[PDB]
Structures are given as C-alpha cells and as structure tokens.
C-alpha cells in the first residue's frame, strides 16, 4: 500500500532498471527519468568508475533524483546468489571464508566469471547479507531492495552439485533471508525480486508474498519464454499477482538483447528502428492483463546504452483507466482502457493498439 510507488493510469505506467557505470546520471539523464517514473532500480556498477563501488554511486544517485522527484522509489540492486566485485561488501565478503559455498567434492561453488555463489543455508551469512542491505535502504537514501537471481538458486541442477540435503537447505535458506530482510529493513521498503518465471520445464509464480512487495518478469516473450504457452502464463501472472495486490514489473525486450552478438554490432540507427518497431506486442501483451501497479521496461539491455533512455509516443498517449477486465479468446487477448483499445494475438504475434 503505502510504501508503493505513486501509481497512475494517466499514460502507460514505466519503471526504469539500469546502471551507468562511467557515472552518475548528468543532470538532464535524471530529470529524464525523474519525470518519467517514480520506480526506478538502480544495477550494479553504478557510477563505479567515480564513486569507486556501487553502494556510493547508488547512494549518490538516489540523492540526485529524490531531489528531482520526491515521490521517487529508487531500489538498490544486491544480488541474493552472486558476490559480484563490484560492491564494497564484497571484500567484506572474502575475509569470511567459513561462509563460502563448495561443491560435494569440497571445490569452492563459483559461476562463470569467477563470480562465488552464496550459501543461503548460512546463518553469519544471511545475517552480514541483510546488514548489506538495510544499511542501503536504512542509513542510506535508498527505498528498496533487488533480490535477484532466485531461479538460479532454485534450479533442478544444482542438487548434483550440492547434494539432495543442501539442495533444500539453501531453499529454506532462500525462504529465511527474504524473512530476515524484511525485518532488516523495515516494513516501510521496497522488496522487489526476480522473479515470475515462465518456461517449457520450469516456471514460477509469484512467491514469499508474506515479505515480498514485487516481481519482476524478466525474460518476457524471449529466451526461454517466447512461446505462446509461456507469454500467456507470464501474462496471466501479472494479472493475478496484481489483483492480489502485489507490484510486478514487466521488463519488455526492444526486438532484441543486449545477449545476442550479432544484433549489437548494428548501427544505432538500426537498434532504434528495431525498437521502434518491436514495441506494439510487448506493449499490448502488458496493457492486455495490466492491473494497478503494474510496470512496463522497454530496452535491450541492463545498460544506460542499451536504449534505456529512449521514449516512445505511445509512452506519452493518453491510456487512462482499465474500463474493462481483460478479454480472452484462445491466444486472442483483448482490453479496453479509457482512451485506448488493446488487441494481442499471442499465437500468431500481432497487436494492435487504437489510441482515442
């Protein structure tokens, strides 16, 4: 309720989520987002390159933009599996050694990146993670926190390398640090996670809502989740973690990512005309089941770069109110909103939205 974001029908309701790394946002990036949303996460890195870790380039971007727009929500971005290099509480995190995550053969358990995973089964461990945090959202300006990187913990996979035993103990472990978060941090914060997950062989919904605030879907209409069977589920999600009152945040793909090569090497000009016209399905496919607090992402990438500050008309239109509950007639899905109509085919891929 009251700790969530200023929510408005007006236009199409936007979140941002991305870093700069060289910097922090110049003046007219923030008022660019500022004005544009009230939710933005902020990644890691974050203005490492002058602020040396991303808590104090977090911490100082925060400060910019709540002074820009006061209703700001601005997330700090703290990996629940991964000890990335770029935070100082990762040179907290290598003077403890105990707490370190091994395989059944007893190697250290890293990912590629030479990127150590957490043992959530840990209690030091969860306890030092959820200071990390609170001192964020807490002592510093932030609002919230990103829990990232839950279907990495929760894969199958990992029980060959754990062991049936640890494989759930670090599922109750997941379990207990969202708990131990909360209380860290304050019932007044944000705890955003990622996330509503939807694939041929493995999926998830909406979860830990005891504690958790909103849910990302990150890989809507691509990856693994571009077929229709996983963008209606996605969509389905949003619609029902939402009438329950929960925030979801849908992060739209800009008819490519930041992950395929080929795709990136295109001139700017391309990216662009790509994203432009890319934009109608995923847009529809979200105003189709948007309920309140609900938030659309458009880019390619987690990168200011990767079209995170590109806008689009059909952002600013008038949209206003559902004024209906969304429609469905096989992978036909349609909506009406007060100024605007709303029509996804899902199986064949069309949309079409009629702005009035």
């Not at 500050?309 to 969304?326: A, I, N, Q, R, S």
């Amino acid at each position: 309720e009251s700790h969530y974001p200023e929510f408005s029908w007006d236009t199409v309701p936007i979140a941002f989520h991305f870093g700069k790394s060289q910097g922090l946002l110049t003046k007219e990036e923030a008022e660019f987002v500022a004005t544009r949303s009230n939710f933005i996460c902020l990644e890691k890195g974050h203005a490492t390159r002058t602020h040396g870790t991303t808590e104090a380039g977090i911490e100082a971007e925060a400060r910019q933009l709540k002074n820009l727009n006061p209703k700001m929500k601005v997330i700090f971005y703290w990996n629940t599996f991964l000890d990335y290099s770029m935070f100082a509480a990762h040179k907290e995190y290598a003077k403890h050694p105990q707490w370190w995550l091994r395989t059944t053969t007893g190697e250290l358990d890293r990912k590629k990146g030479q990127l150590m995973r957490y043992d959530l089964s840990n209690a030091e461990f969860r306890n030092w993670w959820t200071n990390v945090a609170a001192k964020a959202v807490v002592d510093g300006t932030c609002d919230g926190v990103f829990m990232d990187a839950f279907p990495q913990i929760a894969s199958q996979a990992n029980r060959k390398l754990w062991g049936d035993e640890k494989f759930e103990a670090i599922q109750q472990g997941l379990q207990d640090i969202i708990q131990e978060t909360r209380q860290k941090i304050g019932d007044d914060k944000l705890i955003v996670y990622n996330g509503i997950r939807s694939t041929p062989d493995w999926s998830a919904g909406f979860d830990f809502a005891e504690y958790t605030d909103a849910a990302m879907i990150e890989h809507f209409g691509h990856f693994q989740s571009a077929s229709k069977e996983t963008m209606l589920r996605d969509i389905l999600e949003m619609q029902r973690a939402a009438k329950a009152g929960k925030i979801v945040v849908l992060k739209g793909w800009a008819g490519f990512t930041f992950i395929d090569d080929q795709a990136m090497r295109k001139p700017l000009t391309q990216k662009r005309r790509v994203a432009k016209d890319s934009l109608k399905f995923p847009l529809a496919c979200f105003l189709a089941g948007a309920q309140e607090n609900c938030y659309f992402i458009y880019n390619w990438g987690y990168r200011m770069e990767n079209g995170c500050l590109e806008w689009y008309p059909e952002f600013d239109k008038p949209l206003g109110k559902p004024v209906g509950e969304m429609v469905r007639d096989g992978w036909k899905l349609s909506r009406e909103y007060k100024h605007a109509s709303v029509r996804v085919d899902l199986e064949s891929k069309e949309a079409e939205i009629r702005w009035r």
